[PDB]
């Protein structure tokens, strides 16, 4: 995990063209001798602040710009300062995306916006309005298909509809984003989410739907439409689907308003290789042939490099991406953005699944998004601590299945570390009778520091023939507890 000199480790999301990026990397490993590793860990954007607080992680992190103000405020990013000559090569508005407190803190790579993607053979005339979709879906179910499937687990995909009639994240006022003026619970935001939940209520889509099943359903021709970004075009290309990319539908006569992201590359503050990273980025990646290499793996969208974008912009698909982008807004990059996104994620999931009403869900989102910074941090650190031990359960169950002659107290044997950034110690006792605990002692903001979160397993019972269950317990305050953890008792 610690950073090696004379070497570059790069993190980029699994849905981007990382193999293409590794090719720019293997070429770098030719003109310099400097090796390049490209990895795509799960939840890298969450992992990065965890590992880079202790001087670990990649030399270079790729993500949309909205997460980078948080990174910068937390101290984790070197200021990038390119020559004015290099800046002339990228559109000014992309540099604006990656400027925080007047300093640039990442290189902008590409501009992304969601579009309506549709099956031309199945649906030659896609709907201009969201309101058209229930009837269209009814028609399509009769033929054994569906009108629309997209990822309901990430708020990024439902935001264009929430924003259509007036939802907003943070109000921009007197030259700054007002972090206490949140627009996720106004009338327009309410009407947007209501329309989505009505779709689900009336069985035109399924609350369960995630990225993989929507992508699979579309690329196999089972659904006529999906909502996605340019990175998804590659997989459809290898499919038998004749698809188009077009303007998102309107809602109450209003354009859908996607939050537009700028894929960006940050340089780790603890990296020994800030100059090697700067040259890889400026003189290998951000060139026509570097971007082309990444693009032919998975399309980047409208790239920041003027020279290359001139060609790319002749693609009707990229013209559709930019049309949608113009109807939406470039995301803020302020630190409160992740609090906003986590708040809206829960709201959409809870409303869609029927656990809360739309008004209740958005009311709670408004409070969570406008919460004080330590509140968001405390919830995050507790969640992280829990994730740091949850992998231990499954492995514990495999050991119990073989049978134990002695209680197991080695957390390594469960695939766990003895400590993490969120857990000052991780301990375990997997008992011979199944009674067990895997315990995180939490470390971070004073609200949760030295509290415990743990998985508790009851004993199996051989006389009764019963198997013990797992329960998440914590002595953290109730309003800070994650979903499905309760308090402890004795
Ligand atoms: O939902 C919780 C989630 O919120 C935040 O994730 C947001 C991203 O920061 C934001 O950029 C956008 O992510 C999308 C990418 O821009 C796009 O390139 C592609 O990868 O799809 C992404 C969405 O799946 O939207 C998400 C919110 O959905 C936060 O950073 C995450 O840590 C958090 O898990």
- How do 115-119 and 35-39 pair as beta strands? unpaired
DSSP 433-468: TS-EEEEEEE-SSTTTTT-EEEEEEPPPBTTTTBPP
Ligand 1 centroid – CA 190 distance (Å): 21
DSSP 137-183: HHHHHTTT-EEE---SSSHHHHHHHHHHTT-EEEEEETTEEEEEEEE
Q: How many residues does the chain have?
A: 490
Ligand 1 centroid – CA 154 distance (Å): 7
- For 100, the enclosing helix (H) or strand (E) is strand 99-100
Ligand 1 centroid – CA 155 distance (Å): 8
Give the side-chain half-sphere CA count within 13 A for 279.
12
The atom of ligand 1 lying closest to the CA of 15 is: 20
Question: What is the radius of gyration, based on Cα positions, of the chain?
Answer: 24
The backbone torsions φ and ψ at residue 412, rounded to the nearest 5 degrees and listed phi first, read -55, -45
Rounded Cα distance, 80 and 303, in Å: 19
Q: 423 with 442: CB under 8 angstroms?
A: yes
Ligand 1 centroid – CA 342 distance (Å): 9
Ligand 1 centroid – CA 300 distance (Å): 16
As given in the structure block, the two tokens for residue 242 are: 């004749």
- How many Cβ atoms sit within 10 Å of the Cβ of residue 412? 9
For 418, the domain range is 375-487
Close Cβ partners of 18 (under 8 Å, ≥ 6 residues apart): 12, 38, 39, 40, 297
Q: Tell the residue number behind the tokens 């315990």, with chain if given.
A: 439
Ligand 1 proximal residues by C-beta, below 6 Å: 13, 15, 45-46, 64, 66-67, 112, 154-156, 229, 261, 338, 341-342, 345
Q: Is the sign of the CA dihedral 81, 82, 88, 91 positive or negative?
A: negative
Which residue, by CA, sits nearest to atom 25 of ligand 1?
Answer: 156
Residue 450 CA from chain centroid, whole number? 29
Method of elucidation: X-ray
The CATH number covering residue 466 comes to 3.30.700.10
Close Cβ partners of 218 (under 8 Å, ≥ 6 residues apart): 117, 119, 149, 225, 226, 236, 241
The atom of ligand 1 lying closest to the CA of 342 is: 2
As given in the structure block, the two tokens for residue 78 are: 């070197």
The backbone torsions φ and ψ at residue 321, rounded to the nearest 5 degrees and listed phi first, read -55, -50
- Spatial CA neighbour of 454 closest among 369, 365, 380, 392: 392
Angle, helix 187-201 to helix 358-369, in steps of 10 degrees? 130
DSSP 303-329: ESBHHHHHHHTTSHHHHHHHHHHHHSE
Instruction: Give this entry's resolution in angstroms.
Output: 2.0
The atom of ligand 1 lying closest to the CA of 16 is: 20
Q: What share of the chain is helix, strand, coil (3-state, %, to 5)?
A: 40, 25, 35
Q: Ligand 1, residues 324, 325, 341, 483: which to mutate, most atoms within 8 A of Cβ?
A: 341
Residue 148 CA from chain centroid, whole number? 22
- Spatial CA neighbour of 229 closest among 348, 329, 325: 325
As given in the structure block, the two tokens for residue 326 are: 């113009």
């Amino acid at each position: 995990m610690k950073i090696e000199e004379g070497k570059l480790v790069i993190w980029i999301n699994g849905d981007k063209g990382y193999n293409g990026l590794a090719e720019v990397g293997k070429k770098f490993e030719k003109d310099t001798g400097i090796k390049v590793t490209v990895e795509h860990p799960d939840k890298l954007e969450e992992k990065f602040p965890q590992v880079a607080a202790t001087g670990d992680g990649p030399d270079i992190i790729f993500w949309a710009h909205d997460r980078f103000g948080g990174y910068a405020q937390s101290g984790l990013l070197a200021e990038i300062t390119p020559a004015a000559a290099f800046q002339d090569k990228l559109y000014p508005f992309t540099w604006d995306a990656v400027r925080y407190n007047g300093k640039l803190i990442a290189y902008p790579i590409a501009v992304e916006a969601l579009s309506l993607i549709y099956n031309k053979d199945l649906l030659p005339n896609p709907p201009k309005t969201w309101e058209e979709i229930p009837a269209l879906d009814k028609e399509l179910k009769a033929k054994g298909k569906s009108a629309l499937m997209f990822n309901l687990q990430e708020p990024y995909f439902t935001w264009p509809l929430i924003a259509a009639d007036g939802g907003y994240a943070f109000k921009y006022a007197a030259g700054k984003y007002d972090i206490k003026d949140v627009g996720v619970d106004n009338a327009g935001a309410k009407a947007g989410l209501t329309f989505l939940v009505d779709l689900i209520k009336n069985k035109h889509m399924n609350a369960d739907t995630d990225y993989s099943i929507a992508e699979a359903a579309f690329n196999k021709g089972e659904t006529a439409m999906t909502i996605n970004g340019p990175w998804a075009w590659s997989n459809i290309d290898t499919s038998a689907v004749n698809y188009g990319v077009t303007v998102l539908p309107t809602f109450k006569g209003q354009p859908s308003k996607p939050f537009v992201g700028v894929l960006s590359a940050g340089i780790n503050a603890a990296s020994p290789n800030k100059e090697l990273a700067k040259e890889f980025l400026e003189n290998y990646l951000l060139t026509d042939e570097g971007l082309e290499a990444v693009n032919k793996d998975k399309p980047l969208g409208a790239v920041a490099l003027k020279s290359y974008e001139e060609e790319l912009a002749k693609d009707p698909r990229i013209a559709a991406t930019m049309e949608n982008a113009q109807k939406g807004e470039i995301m803020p990059n302020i630190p409160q953005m992740s609090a906003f996104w986590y708040a809206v994620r829960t709201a959409v999931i809870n409303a869609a699944s029927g656990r809360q009403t739309v008004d209740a869900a958005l009311a709670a989102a408004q409070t969570n998004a406008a919460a004080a910074y330590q509140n968001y941090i405390a919830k995050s650190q507790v969640s992280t601590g829990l994730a740091d031990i949850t992998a231990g359960k499954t492995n514990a169950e495999t050991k119990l299945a073989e049978g134990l002659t002695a209680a197991l107290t080695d957390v390594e044997a469960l695939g766990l570390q003895k400590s993490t950034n969120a857990c000052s110690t991780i301990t375990t006792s997997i008992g011979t009778n199944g009674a067990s605990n895997i315990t995180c002692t939490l470390k971070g903001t004073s609200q949760i520091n030295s509290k415990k979160i743990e998985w508790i397993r009851d004993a199996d019972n051989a006389t009764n023939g019963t198997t013990g269950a797992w329960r998440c317990k914590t002595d953290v305050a109730e309003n800070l507890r994650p979903k499905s953890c309760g308090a402890s008792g004795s």
